[PDB]
């Protein structure tokens, strides 16, 4: 989707732009925002040679999964807990991204409506 229909048919001025995002500063609506912490050091990630696209905030679970995959080689059906944990925390990262998108959308629509209302008040 409905977001595509809303942006491409409805009013796109209150619809977030995925390329140009975010347009608001990170501590605008929040009194304080906690800094996201990373568990795996740069050297561990380099030594594991994960990839340039797998070196996100989720790399520790991936390193664990790779280690247990290498350890239990012939039994290729044993690394289910580690895979599940990695997939779960990936899902959490995705949910956080959806949260950021929805926050940006409501920020844009609220700010634009409030600017229009303030201009209307100043016009009368």
């Amino acid at each position: 989707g409905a977001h595509l229909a809303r942006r491409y048919l409805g009013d796109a001025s209150k619809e977030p732009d995925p390329l140009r995002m975010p347009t608001f500063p990170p501590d605008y609506g929040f009194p304080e925002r906690k800094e996201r912490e990373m568990v795996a050091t740069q050297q561990e990630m380099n030594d594991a040679q994960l990839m340039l696209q797998q070196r996100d905030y989720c790399a520790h679970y991936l390193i664990q999964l790779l280690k247990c995959k290498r350890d239990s080689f012939p039994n290729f059906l044993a690394c289910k807990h580690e895979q599940h944990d990695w997939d779960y925390c990936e899902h959490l990262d995705y949910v956080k991204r959806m949260k950021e998108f929805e926050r940006e959308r409501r920020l844009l629509q609220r700010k634009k409506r409030r600017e229009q209302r303030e201009a209307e008040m100043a016009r009368g």
């Binding site: 929040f30 959806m98 949260k99 998108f101 929805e102 926050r103 409501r106 609220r110 409506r113 409030r114």
Partner: peptide, 15 residues
């Protein structure tokens, strides 16, 4: 569902 997300956790001022 993004609609069910409260405004406190997403943090936008009440207009």
């Amino acid at each position: 569902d993004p609609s069910q997300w409260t405004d406190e956790e997403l943090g936008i001022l009440p207009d």
